[PDB]
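$ run holo --ligand "guanosine-5'-diphosphate" --emit tokens
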Amino acid sequence: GPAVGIDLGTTYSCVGVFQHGKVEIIANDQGNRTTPSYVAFTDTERLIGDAAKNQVAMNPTNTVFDAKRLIGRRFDDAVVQSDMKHWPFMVVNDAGRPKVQVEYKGETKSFYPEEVSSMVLTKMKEIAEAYLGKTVTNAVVTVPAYFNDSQRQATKDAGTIAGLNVLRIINEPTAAAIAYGLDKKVGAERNVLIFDLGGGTFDVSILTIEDGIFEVKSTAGDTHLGGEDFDNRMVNHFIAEFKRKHKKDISENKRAVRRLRTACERAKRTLSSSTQASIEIDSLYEGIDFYTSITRARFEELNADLFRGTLDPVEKALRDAKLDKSQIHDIVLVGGSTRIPKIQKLLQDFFNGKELNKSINPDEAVAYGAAVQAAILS
Amino acid sequence: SNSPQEEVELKKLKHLEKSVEKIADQLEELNKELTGIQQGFLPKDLQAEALCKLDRRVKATIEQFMKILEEIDTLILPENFKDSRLKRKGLVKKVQAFLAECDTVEQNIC
Ligand SMILES: Nc1nc2c(ncn2[C@@H]2O[C@H](COP(=O)(O)OP(=O)(O)O)[C@@H](O)[C@H]2O)c(=O)[nH]1
Ligand SMILES: Nc1nc2c(ncn2[C@@H]2O[C@H](COP(=O)(O)OP(=O)(O)O)[C@@H](O)[C@H]2O)c(=O)[nH]1
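-- output --
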């Protein structure tokens, strides 16, 4: 088998392969190009990806996710400590290292974050294997640029456990820059800004490419910002509208809030290519039918602070890197939320009308660059 | 003035009705399993273990009903699609009556 590029994500992972002069992003057993970074443990078995995610309501305490927030960290780490209140699975202390404590096959089992990430990597390896019809041993796995050696080593270790020969571990903004062939460009040093906005985290990295050498000049962002927050504001809007029209509070019912939330995420996606989205939810709450619509302009207003807020990390990254925005040669969009036209407008306007590298699917760009790298190292 | 466009939405709803019937059958089986536990010779500890395995199966049933609701909620039917709108409302009320029966079981075991 060939060598693949795996983007090991916080919430979603993605695998690609370079073949026939092109990058193929490999769809999983459910036809999905992205697989949730979820693992579930039960009385007789272990579930990974979509299966694990779907079975969460049934097995909340034993469904592990967000391992990327724990991998390579100490128990005392700010992120580990802050996050566990939210996580339904238990996070214990094994001599200063977090472990996920779960009930598995009729016994209490404790797993390190690399053992959890190795299960996700094993699935990504299987995804590529079913598509190619060949054994897949070699892989290039991405990590965030702010990752320290311990975090980087733990990710490499998750590879080794999964049965992978980790050819190289590369930075996510380096992989996104490789995907667009920014190193192949002719001229002097190139200052590249990678704007990465997904579902839960925001990451801005500025890199300098001089004679094919990638140097991370600065990192900034928001650990807890993404598409979920945009959904939240849409939900606030609809609940308020339901209140105005019917004088009823749907927040009382969590199944009503969930149906409205699911419709909101879908309406948000429509608003990236259309200027209006319509929603029809029968018997939403207290037998009332909620038929409504939202304009792209209204969606933008609801999230105005969050969208604008994305420029603060950008200004900060420029500051640490000691650069003027006029010094930024290339802007790369990464993450599903960078599909938002307002976000695209804010970033272009900020950089005096410079065009954005957004042709490659934002969710797949990191996997894309890692698939190009894996091919080079074969 | 019945349209071919409406027949596509009615087909969607027919597929979702079948899916509702199948989950409904599971609920009936869980009700029969619950009677089994109640009327059988299990001691307190094994009764607690059995009803919890049943609790997990009833949460799964609820999740399957919630995903049916979530699929129905993708439908957009204009005012003219009267037959589609009536079928959609009837199907939603039918699932909500099933979710209420799931809750009766779920809230009172394990
Ligand atoms: N508005 C909008 N958001 C999108 C679109 N496609 C994906 N997203 C959002 O992107 C988010 C997921 O981000 P992603 O890059 O896949 O990865 P993550 O950072 O690991 O969560 C979700 O909140 C989606 O709603 C789209 O077409 N429009
Ligand atoms: N209302 C409506 N129902 C249809 C139409 N075409 C098919 N159906 C029925 O709706 C269901 C959808 O099934 P389908 O995918 O077409 O075929 P099947 O999988 O072989 O049953 C079946 O009961 C069909 O007989 C249509 O034009 N309108």
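-- notes --
Residues B 7, 10-11, 14-15 surround guanosine-5'-diphosphate (ligand 2) (CB under 6 Å).
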